[PDB]
Coordinates of C-alpha atoms in Angstrom, one line a residue:
Chain A
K1 CA -15.8 6.9 -34.6
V2 CA -15.3 9.0 -31.4
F3 CA -15.1 6.9 -28.4
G4 CA -16.0 7.5 -24.7
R5 CA -13.1 7.4 -22.2
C6 CA -14.5 4.2 -20.4
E7 CA -15.8 2.7 -23.8
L8 CA -12.2 2.9 -25.0
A9 CA -10.7 1.9 -21.8
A10 CA -13.0 -1.4 -22.0
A11 CA -12.0 -2.1 -25.7
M12 CA -8.1 -1.4 -25.1
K13 CA -8.3 -3.9 -22.2
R14 CA -10.1 -6.4 -24.3
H15 CA -7.1 -6.2 -26.9
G16 CA -4.3 -6.9 -24.2
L17 CA -3.1 -3.5 -23.7
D18 CA -3.4 -3.3 -19.9
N19 CA 0.0 -3.4 -18.4
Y20 CA 1.6 -4.2 -21.9
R21 CA 5.3 -3.9 -21.4
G22 CA 4.3 -2.6 -17.8
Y23 CA 2.2 0.5 -18.8
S24 CA -0.8 0.4 -17.0
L25 CA -4.1 0.9 -19.0
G26 CA -4.9 4.6 -18.1
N27 CA -1.6 5.4 -20.2
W28 CA -3.2 4.1 -23.4
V29 CA -6.7 6.0 -22.7
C30 CA -4.9 9.2 -21.9
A31 CA -2.5 9.1 -25.2
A32 CA -5.5 8.2 -27.4
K33 CA -7.2 11.4 -25.7
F34 CA -4.3 13.9 -26.3
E35 CA -3.4 12.2 -29.9
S36 CA -6.5 11.6 -31.5
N37 CA -9.1 13.1 -29.1
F38 CA -10.5 9.6 -29.1
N39 CA -11.4 9.9 -32.7
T40 CA -10.7 6.8 -35.0
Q41 CA -10.9 8.7 -38.3
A42 CA -8.1 11.3 -37.1
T43 CA -5.4 11.7 -39.7
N44 CA -2.8 14.5 -39.3
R45 CA -0.3 15.5 -42.1
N46 CA 3.3 16.3 -40.5
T47 CA 5.7 18.7 -41.8
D48 CA 8.0 16.1 -43.2
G49 CA 5.3 14.8 -45.6
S50 CA 4.1 11.6 -43.6
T51 CA 0.7 11.6 -41.9
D52 CA -0.5 10.3 -38.6
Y53 CA -3.4 8.0 -38.6
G54 CA -6.2 6.7 -36.4
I55 CA -6.6 7.1 -32.7
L56 CA -3.1 6.4 -31.6
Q57 CA -1.7 8.7 -34.3
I58 CA 0.7 6.1 -35.9
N59 CA 2.9 7.6 -38.5
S60 CA 3.3 6.4 -42.3
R61 CA 7.1 7.1 -42.3
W62 CA 7.9 4.1 -40.3
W63 CA 4.8 2.2 -39.2
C64 CA 2.4 2.1 -42.2
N65 CA 2.5 2.5 -45.9
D66 CA 0.1 4.8 -47.4
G67 CA 1.7 5.3 -50.8
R68 CA 2.4 8.9 -50.3
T69 CA 5.3 8.7 -48.1
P70 CA 9.0 9.2 -48.9
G71 CA 10.9 6.5 -47.2
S72 CA 8.2 4.1 -45.7
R73 CA 9.7 1.3 -43.8
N74 CA 6.1 0.1 -43.0
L75 CA 7.4 -1.9 -39.9
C76 CA 3.8 -2.8 -38.9
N77 CA 3.3 -4.3 -42.4
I78 CA 0.1 -2.4 -42.5
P79 CA -1.6 -0.3 -44.9
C80 CA -2.1 3.0 -42.8
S81 CA -5.9 3.1 -44.0
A82 CA -6.3 -0.3 -41.9
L83 CA -5.5 2.4 -39.0
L84 CA -8.6 4.5 -39.8
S85 CA -11.0 1.8 -38.9
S86 CA -13.3 1.6 -35.8
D87 CA -12.3 -1.7 -34.8
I88 CA -9.1 -0.8 -33.0
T89 CA -7.4 -4.4 -33.4
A90 CA -4.7 -3.1 -36.2
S91 CA -4.1 0.0 -34.4
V92 CA -3.5 -1.8 -31.1
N93 CA -1.2 -4.8 -32.5
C94 CA 1.0 -1.9 -34.4
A95 CA 1.1 0.1 -31.0
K96 CA 2.2 -3.1 -29.4
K97 CA 5.4 -3.2 -31.9
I98 CA 6.0 0.5 -31.5
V99 CA 6.1 0.2 -27.6
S100 CA 8.3 -3.0 -27.7
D101 CA 11.0 -0.8 -29.3
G102 CA 13.3 1.3 -27.2
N103 CA 11.5 4.5 -26.2
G104 CA 8.3 2.7 -24.7
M105 CA 5.7 5.2 -24.7
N106 CA 7.7 8.0 -25.3
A107 CA 7.2 7.4 -29.0
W108 CA 3.9 9.2 -28.8
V109 CA 4.7 12.9 -28.1
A110 CA 1.1 13.8 -26.4
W111 CA 1.7 11.0 -24.0
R112 CA 5.1 12.4 -22.8
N113 CA 3.8 16.0 -22.5
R114 CA 0.6 15.5 -21.1
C115 CA 0.2 12.1 -19.7
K116 CA 3.6 11.1 -18.2
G117 CA 3.9 11.8 -14.7
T118 CA 0.3 12.6 -14.1
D119 CA -2.2 10.3 -12.4
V120 CA -3.1 8.4 -15.7
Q121 CA -5.2 5.9 -13.5
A122 CA -8.1 8.7 -13.5
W123 CA -8.7 8.0 -16.9
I124 CA -10.0 4.6 -16.0
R125 CA -11.3 5.3 -12.7
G126 CA -15.1 5.1 -12.9
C127 CA -15.3 2.6 -15.8
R128 CA -16.8 -0.8 -15.4
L129 CA -14.1 -3.0 -16.9
Chain B
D1 CA -9.7 5.1 2.8
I2 CA -8.7 1.6 2.1
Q3 CA -6.7 -0.3 4.6
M4 CA -4.7 -3.6 4.0
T5 CA -4.6 -6.2 6.4
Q6 CA -1.3 -8.4 6.0
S7 CA -1.4 -12.0 7.2
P8 CA 0.5 -13.7 8.9
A9 CA 2.7 -11.2 11.2
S10 CA 5.7 -13.6 11.3
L11 CA 6.4 -17.0 9.8
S12 CA 8.9 -19.8 10.5
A13 CA 9.7 -21.8 7.5
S14 CA 12.9 -23.9 6.4
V15 CA 14.9 -23.4 3.3
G16 CA 13.2 -25.0 0.3
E17 CA 9.5 -24.6 1.9
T18 CA 6.9 -22.8 -0.1
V19 CA 5.2 -20.2 1.8
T20 CA 2.2 -17.9 1.1
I21 CA 1.6 -14.3 2.5
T22 CA -1.9 -12.5 2.3
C23 CA -3.2 -8.9 2.0
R24 CA -6.8 -8.3 2.3
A25 CA -8.2 -4.8 1.1
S26 CA -11.2 -3.1 2.8
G27 CA -12.3 -2.1 -0.8
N28 CA -11.5 -3.4 -4.3
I29 CA -8.1 -2.1 -5.3
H30 CA -8.3 -3.4 -8.8
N31 CA -5.1 -5.2 -8.7
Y32 CA -3.0 -2.2 -8.3
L33 CA -1.0 -4.1 -5.5
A34 CA 2.7 -3.9 -5.2
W35 CA 5.0 -6.2 -2.9
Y36 CA 8.3 -5.0 -1.5
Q37 CA 10.9 -7.0 0.4
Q38 CA 13.1 -5.4 3.0
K39 CA 16.2 -7.1 4.4
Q40 CA 17.8 -6.3 7.6
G41 CA 18.0 -2.5 7.8
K42 CA 17.8 -1.8 4.2
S43 CA 15.6 0.3 1.8
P44 CA 12.8 -2.0 0.8
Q45 CA 12.9 -3.3 -2.8
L46 CA 10.2 -3.7 -5.3
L47 CA 9.1 -7.5 -6.0
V48 CA 5.9 -7.8 -7.9
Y49 CA 3.9 -4.8 -9.2
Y50 CA 0.3 -4.8 -10.4
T51 CA -0.4 -8.0 -8.6
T52 CA 1.7 -10.3 -10.9
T53 CA 4.3 -8.7 -12.6
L54 CA 8.0 -9.6 -11.3
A55 CA 10.1 -6.6 -11.1
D56 CA 13.4 -6.4 -13.0
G57 CA 15.8 -9.2 -11.8
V58 CA 13.5 -10.9 -9.5
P59 CA 13.3 -14.7 -9.3
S60 CA 10.8 -17.0 -10.6
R61 CA 10.2 -18.9 -7.3
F62 CA 8.1 -15.5 -6.5
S63 CA 4.6 -15.3 -7.8
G64 CA 1.8 -12.6 -6.9
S65 CA -2.1 -13.5 -7.4
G66 CA -5.5 -12.1 -6.4
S67 CA -8.1 -9.7 -7.6
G68 CA -10.4 -7.1 -6.0
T69 CA -9.8 -7.6 -2.3
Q70 CA -7.5 -10.7 -1.7
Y71 CA -4.2 -10.7 -3.1
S72 CA -1.2 -13.1 -2.4
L73 CA 2.5 -13.7 -2.7
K74 CA 3.8 -17.1 -2.9
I75 CA 7.3 -18.1 -2.6
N76 CA 8.2 -21.5 -3.9
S77 CA 11.6 -23.3 -2.4
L78 CA 12.7 -20.8 -0.2
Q79 CA 16.2 -19.6 -0.3
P80 CA 18.3 -18.3 2.5
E81 CA 18.3 -14.8 0.9
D82 CA 14.4 -14.7 1.2
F83 CA 14.2 -14.5 5.1
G84 CA 13.3 -10.7 6.0
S85 CA 10.1 -8.6 5.8
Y86 CA 7.4 -8.5 3.0
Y87 CA 5.2 -5.8 2.8
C88 CA 2.1 -5.2 0.4
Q89 CA 0.9 -1.5 -0.6
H90 CA -2.5 -0.7 -2.7
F91 CA -2.2 2.0 -5.3
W92 CA -5.9 2.6 -6.1
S93 CA -6.2 6.3 -5.5
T94 CA -4.4 8.3 -3.0
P95 CA -3.7 7.9 -0.2
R96 CA -2.0 4.6 -0.4
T97 CA -1.6 2.4 2.8
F98 CA 1.0 -0.5 3.2
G99 CA 0.0 -3.8 5.2
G100 CA 1.7 -4.4 8.6
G101 CA 4.6 -6.7 7.3
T102 CA 5.3 -10.5 7.5
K103 CA 8.8 -11.4 8.8
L104 CA 9.8 -14.5 7.4
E105 CA 12.2 -16.3 9.9
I106 CA 14.4 -19.4 9.7
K107 CA 12.9 -22.6 11.5
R108 CA 15.3 -24.5 13.5
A109 CA 15.5 -26.9 16.5
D110 CA 14.0 -26.2 19.8
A111 CA 16.4 -24.5 22.2
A112 CA 16.6 -23.7 25.9
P113 CA 18.5 -20.5 27.1
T114 CA 21.7 -20.1 28.8
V115 CA 20.3 -17.7 31.6
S116 CA 23.0 -15.5 33.7
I117 CA 22.1 -13.3 36.3
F118 CA 24.8 -10.5 37.2
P119 CA 25.0 -8.6 40.5
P120 CA 25.4 -4.8 40.5
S121 CA 28.9 -3.5 39.5
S122 CA 30.7 -1.8 42.6
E123 CA 31.3 1.4 40.5
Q124 CA 27.5 1.6 40.0
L125 CA 26.6 1.2 43.7
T126 CA 29.2 3.8 44.4
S127 CA 27.1 6.1 42.3
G128 CA 24.1 4.9 44.1
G129 CA 22.1 3.1 41.4
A130 CA 21.9 -0.7 41.2
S131 CA 21.0 -2.7 37.7
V132 CA 20.8 -6.3 38.2
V133 CA 21.2 -8.0 34.9
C134 CA 20.0 -11.3 33.4
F135 CA 21.1 -12.5 30.0
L136 CA 19.1 -15.3 28.4
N137 CA 21.1 -16.5 25.4
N138 CA 20.7 -18.4 22.5
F139 CA 17.2 -20.0 22.9
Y140 CA 14.5 -21.0 20.2
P141 CA 11.8 -20.5 19.7
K142 CA 11.5 -16.7 20.5
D143 CA 8.7 -16.9 22.9
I144 CA 9.9 -16.7 26.6
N145 CA 8.6 -14.8 29.7
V146 CA 11.1 -13.8 31.9
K147 CA 10.0 -12.5 35.5
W148 CA 12.1 -10.9 38.5
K149 CA 11.7 -11.7 42.2
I150 CA 12.9 -9.9 45.1
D151 CA 12.9 -11.8 48.4
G152 CA 10.1 -14.1 47.1
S153 CA 7.6 -11.6 45.8
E154 CA 7.7 -11.0 42.1
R155 CA 8.3 -7.6 40.6
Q156 CA 7.2 -5.8 37.5
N157 CA 8.0 -2.2 38.2
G158 CA 11.8 -1.2 36.9
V159 CA 12.2 -4.3 34.3
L160 CA 13.7 -3.6 31.1
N161 CA 14.2 -6.1 28.1
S162 CA 15.6 -6.1 24.6
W163 CA 15.9 -8.8 22.0
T164 CA 18.3 -9.7 19.2
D165 CA 17.2 -10.2 15.6
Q166 CA 17.4 -13.9 14.9
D167 CA 21.0 -15.0 14.7
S168 CA 22.7 -15.2 11.3
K169 CA 24.5 -18.4 12.5
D170 CA 22.4 -21.0 14.3
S171 CA 19.4 -19.0 14.1
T172 CA 18.8 -18.3 17.9
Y173 CA 17.4 -15.4 19.9
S174 CA 19.1 -13.8 23.1
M175 CA 17.6 -11.5 25.2
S176 CA 18.6 -9.1 28.1
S177 CA 16.6 -8.1 31.1
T178 CA 17.7 -5.4 33.6
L179 CA 15.9 -4.6 36.9
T180 CA 17.1 -1.0 38.1
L181 CA 16.9 -0.1 41.8
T182 CA 18.5 2.5 43.8
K183 CA 21.5 1.4 46.1
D184 CA 19.3 2.0 48.9
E185 CA 16.4 -0.2 48.1
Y186 CA 18.9 -2.7 46.8
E187 CA 20.6 -3.2 50.2
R188 CA 17.0 -3.5 51.9
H189 CA 16.6 -6.8 50.3
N190 CA 18.6 -10.1 49.7
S191 CA 17.7 -12.7 47.0
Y192 CA 17.4 -11.6 43.5
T193 CA 15.8 -14.0 40.9
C194 CA 15.6 -13.9 37.3
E195 CA 13.0 -16.6 36.1
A196 CA 12.4 -17.8 32.8
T197 CA 9.7 -19.9 31.0
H198 CA 9.9 -21.2 27.6
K199 CA 8.5 -24.2 25.7
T200 CA 11.4 -26.7 26.6
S201 CA 10.5 -25.9 30.4
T202 CA 8.3 -28.1 32.3
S203 CA 8.9 -25.9 35.2
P204 CA 10.9 -22.4 35.0
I205 CA 14.7 -22.1 34.4
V206 CA 15.4 -20.2 37.7
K207 CA 18.6 -18.1 38.5
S208 CA 19.1 -16.5 41.7
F209 CA 22.0 -14.7 43.8
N210 CA 22.0 -13.3 47.2
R211 CA 23.3 -10.2 48.4
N212 CA 25.6 -11.7 51.2
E213 CA 27.1 -14.4 49.1
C214 CA 29.9 -13.4 46.8
Chain C
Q1 CA 21.2 5.2 -13.4
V2 CA 18.6 6.2 -10.8
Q3 CA 19.6 7.5 -7.4
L4 CA 17.5 9.1 -4.6
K5 CA 19.4 10.4 -1.7
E6 CA 17.9 12.2 1.5
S7 CA 19.4 14.7 3.8
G8 CA 17.8 15.5 7.3
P9 CA 19.0 17.4 10.5
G10 CA 19.4 13.9 12.6
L11 CA 18.0 15.1 15.9
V12 CA 15.1 17.8 16.3
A13 CA 13.4 19.2 19.5
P14 CA 9.8 18.3 20.1
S15 CA 7.2 20.7 18.5
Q16 CA 9.6 22.5 16.2
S17 CA 9.6 22.0 12.2
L18 CA 11.4 19.4 10.1
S19 CA 12.8 19.7 6.5
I20 CA 14.2 17.0 4.7
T21 CA 15.7 17.1 1.1
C22 CA 15.5 14.3 -1.2
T23 CA 17.8 15.1 -4.4
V24 CA 17.5 12.8 -7.4
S25 CA 19.7 12.1 -10.3
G26 CA 18.8 9.9 -13.4
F27 CA 15.2 11.0 -14.1
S28 CA 13.7 14.4 -14.5
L29 CA 11.1 15.4 -11.8
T30 CA 8.8 16.4 -14.4
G31 CA 8.1 12.7 -15.4
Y32 CA 7.9 10.7 -12.3
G33 CA 6.2 11.3 -9.0
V34 CA 8.4 10.9 -5.6
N35 CA 6.7 9.5 -2.5
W36 CA 7.7 9.8 1.2
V37 CA 7.5 6.8 3.5
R38 CA 8.7 6.4 6.9
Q39 CA 9.3 3.6 9.4
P40 CA 9.2 3.9 13.0
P41 CA 12.0 1.7 14.7
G42 CA 10.6 -1.7 14.7
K43 CA 7.4 -1.0 12.7
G44 CA 6.1 -1.3 9.3
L45 CA 6.3 1.2 6.6
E46 CA 3.8 4.2 6.7
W47 CA 3.0 6.4 3.8
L48 CA 3.2 10.1 4.3
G49 CA 2.4 11.6 0.9
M50 CA 3.6 12.3 -2.6
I51 CA 4.1 14.9 -5.4
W52 CA 3.1 13.9 -8.9
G53 CA 5.3 15.0 -11.9
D54 CA 2.6 17.7 -12.5
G55 CA 3.3 19.1 -8.9
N56 CA -0.2 17.8 -7.3
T57 CA 0.5 16.6 -4.0
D58 CA -1.5 14.0 -1.9
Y59 CA -1.1 13.1 1.9
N60 CA -1.8 10.4 4.7
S61 CA -5.4 11.5 5.9
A62 CA -4.1 11.8 9.4
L63 CA -0.7 14.0 8.9
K64 CA -2.3 16.2 6.2
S65 CA -2.2 19.2 8.7
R66 CA 1.5 18.7 9.6
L67 CA 2.8 17.5 6.3
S68 CA 3.4 19.8 3.5
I69 CA 5.4 18.5 0.2
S70 CA 7.1 20.5 -2.5
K71 CA 9.9 20.4 -5.1
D72 CA 12.4 22.4 -7.3
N73 CA 12.4 20.7 -10.8
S74 CA 15.8 22.3 -11.9
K75 CA 17.3 21.3 -9.0
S76 CA 16.3 17.9 -8.9
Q77 CA 14.9 18.5 -5.2
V78 CA 11.8 17.2 -3.4
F79 CA 11.2 18.6 0.1
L80 CA 9.3 17.2 3.1
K81 CA 8.3 19.7 6.0
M82 CA 6.8 18.4 9.0
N83 CA 5.6 20.6 11.9
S84 CA 4.2 20.1 15.4
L85 CA 6.5 17.2 16.0
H86 CA 6.3 14.7 18.6
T87 CA 8.5 12.1 19.7
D88 CA 6.3 9.6 17.8
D89 CA 8.0 11.0 14.5
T90 CA 11.3 9.2 15.3
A91 CA 11.8 7.0 12.4
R92 CA 13.8 6.6 9.2
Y93 CA 12.4 8.8 6.4
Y94 CA 12.8 7.5 2.7
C95 CA 11.8 9.1 -0.4
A96 CA 11.1 6.7 -3.6
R97 CA 10.5 7.1 -7.2
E98 CA 7.1 6.4 -8.3
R99 CA 6.8 4.7 -12.0
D100 CA 3.5 3.8 -12.9
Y101 CA 1.8 2.8 -9.8
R102 CA 4.9 1.1 -8.0
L103 CA 7.8 2.9 -6.1
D104 CA 10.6 1.2 -7.8
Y105 CA 13.6 3.0 -6.7
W106 CA 14.1 3.8 -3.1
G107 CA 16.6 6.2 -1.4
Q108 CA 18.7 4.9 1.6
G109 CA 16.8 6.7 4.4
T110 CA 17.7 9.4 6.9
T111 CA 17.1 8.6 10.7
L112 CA 15.3 11.5 12.5
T113 CA 15.1 11.4 16.4
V114 CA 12.7 13.8 18.1
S115 CA 14.2 14.4 21.3
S116 CA 14.5 17.0 24.0
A117 CA 17.6 15.2 25.5
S118 CA 21.2 16.8 25.2
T119 CA 24.4 14.9 24.7
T120 CA 25.2 12.4 27.4
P121 CA 28.3 10.3 27.6
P122 CA 27.5 6.7 28.7
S123 CA 28.5 4.9 32.0
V124 CA 30.1 1.5 31.4
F125 CA 30.0 -0.7 34.1
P126 CA 31.8 -4.2 33.9
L127 CA 29.6 -6.9 34.8
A128 CA 31.4 -10.0 36.3
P129 CA 30.0 -13.1 37.5
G130 CA 29.0 -13.8 41.0
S131 CA 31.8 -16.4 42.0
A132 CA 29.6 -19.2 40.6
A133 CA 31.6 -22.5 39.8
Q134 CA 33.1 -21.2 36.4
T135 CA 34.9 -24.5 36.2
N136 CA 32.6 -25.5 33.5
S137 CA 33.4 -25.0 29.7
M138 CA 32.3 -21.6 29.3
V139 CA 31.6 -18.1 31.0
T140 CA 29.7 -15.3 30.1
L141 CA 30.8 -11.7 31.0
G142 CA 29.2 -8.4 29.9
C143 CA 29.3 -4.5 29.9
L144 CA 26.3 -2.5 30.9
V145 CA 26.4 0.7 28.5
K146 CA 24.1 3.2 30.5
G147 CA 22.8 6.5 30.3
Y148 CA 23.6 7.8 26.8
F149 CA 22.3 10.2 24.2
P150 CA 22.2 10.2 21.1
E151 CA 22.4 6.9 19.6
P152 CA 24.7 5.1 18.6
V153 CA 27.5 3.6 20.8
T154 CA 29.9 1.1 19.5
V155 CA 31.0 -2.0 21.7
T156 CA 33.9 -4.2 20.7
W157 CA 35.4 -6.6 23.0
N158 CA 39.1 -6.7 23.2
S159 CA 39.8 -4.1 20.7
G160 CA 37.5 -6.5 18.5
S161 CA 39.9 -9.3 18.5
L162 CA 37.2 -11.2 20.6
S163 CA 34.1 -11.5 18.2
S164 CA 32.7 -15.0 18.7
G165 CA 30.1 -15.3 21.7
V166 CA 29.5 -11.5 21.5
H167 CA 25.8 -10.6 21.7
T168 CA 25.3 -6.6 21.7
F169 CA 21.5 -6.3 22.5
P170 CA 19.9 -3.2 21.0
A171 CA 19.4 -0.1 23.2
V172 CA 16.4 0.5 25.1
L173 CA 15.1 4.0 26.1
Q174 CA 14.1 4.9 29.5
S175 CA 13.9 8.6 30.4
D176 CA 15.2 10.4 27.5
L177 CA 18.5 8.2 27.8
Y178 CA 19.6 4.9 26.3
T179 CA 20.7 1.6 27.8
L180 CA 22.5 -1.2 26.3
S181 CA 24.4 -4.3 27.1
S182 CA 26.7 -7.1 25.4
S183 CA 27.5 -10.6 26.8
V184 CA 30.7 -12.4 25.6
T185 CA 31.2 -16.1 26.2
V186 CA 34.9 -17.3 26.7
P187 CA 35.9 -20.8 28.1
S188 CA 37.3 -20.8 31.8
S189 CA 40.4 -21.3 30.3
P190 CA 40.6 -17.8 28.8
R191 CA 38.9 -16.2 32.1
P192 CA 40.4 -14.5 34.5
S193 CA 43.8 -16.0 33.2
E194 CA 43.7 -13.6 30.0
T195 CA 41.9 -10.3 30.0
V196 CA 38.8 -9.3 28.4
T197 CA 37.8 -5.6 28.2
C198 CA 34.8 -4.0 26.7
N199 CA 35.6 -0.9 24.8
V200 CA 32.8 1.7 24.3
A201 CA 32.8 4.8 22.0
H202 CA 30.1 7.2 21.8
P203 CA 31.4 9.4 19.0
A204 CA 28.9 12.2 20.0
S205 CA 30.6 13.0 23.3
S206 CA 34.1 12.0 21.9
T207 CA 34.1 9.4 24.6
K208 CA 36.1 6.3 24.7
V209 CA 36.0 3.8 27.6
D210 CA 37.3 0.4 28.2
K211 CA 36.8 -1.4 31.4
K212 CA 38.8 -4.8 31.9
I213 CA 36.3 -7.6 33.5
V214 CA 37.7 -8.5 36.6
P215 CA 36.5 -11.3 39.1
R216 CA 34.1 -10.7 42.3
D217 CA 35.4 -10.2 45.6
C218 CA 35.3 -11.8 49.0

């Protein structure tokens, strides 16, 4: 699916990402946008032979197993294909386990290159939430 | 832009009491409200952000609430270390604005001042200036009107006042008042009164001197 | 370990321009915005402006024409410049870190006083009681510290051996210059038997003055 800015904002909010581990909602909307361009079926093979999956680009080497990846720790205990749905529940729940580890949101490179230190509350100003 | 209306301005409460501060916004600020505490002459420090989240290291007796335009900070079972000033700040778009402040102060027993008027120093009269000084020390509450009277008439021009912050021990207030005159105008008069009205007083505490007595 | 330290010029004349630096350590300027807040003596906090991690700047509506903010990322330095200064911008100026819509690390502050006045050493005038029946438990004595600039002045009684009973009142401004007082309460039995002196230093003019409080005459 390709979401709209406020459409996504309201759904991340329904799943509890507003202020999850103190990251305001706009942080999440902004990272969906520079990771997947709001497209839930986004998939990107990475030089190390792993693939990033779904709207928050969760990686198969650590977070989900997809069969094809050398060393899959599968820490979210999820099939990577579960992340290509249009129901964001499983991509959110694993995002909650990624952001509770050490680096918070810095896990996502696009967030800490395009969102961190900008007015991310702009991604939700205008939405009915 | 959005303005914040903090209420009350000042508040007296005993340790162990539970107080509640209020910020009201001219617009929906959508829970982007932070609360800061500022102790005597210190940089403010973050308490609650995004309306309800306690900052790292902050005690559980502190709790933020609100949505839209009405936000609140509740403090339950006040400790000595919670007196000082509290500020809310909205964070919905720029510009951000803070509320006015709430000065939380230690409630104590009623107390009358020790008034003391002082005639000008001779070294001053030599230079030709004349400050009559009046100390109103260690009273409670803070409200007190001081008024000067030269030869039966009250005077307003020339008076200069100063208060101290509530005392660390015994939590009282003290206040200096100074009527300055010139040597010249001073020797043209005779009694100098320092008059004080303050809650305990049925009729004011009065303190006089006359230039001819010593 | 996050640190924010601001450095200003202390005193400045009306209508000239002010640059304050705020050097930061412990985070990169690219990743966090820094705010500038200020507090007039005995007044609330007031937001002046900010510069986001990406360099965009925002300002207080009403001071927008006078404020200008910028930063050198490499150097870890944010800069505040005010112009058309008025005596009203006499305040303590702080910079704060912003980390997701809360100012979470503030600096200590720098005081700025905007005045035309020149350094004036005080006039300490011993205040003795009129000779009123000081045959009662305690007696109150003072020192009037009058006419100085700039603040502060330090007031110790008896080289600081006398500490209890002291009440230094904060200085009020009259016509460019400051005036301060201190009372002290000693029992009749200390006074004038032993001596009480107020000692006053005004570092700025390199002035130390001590006045012994002596009883009144007739």
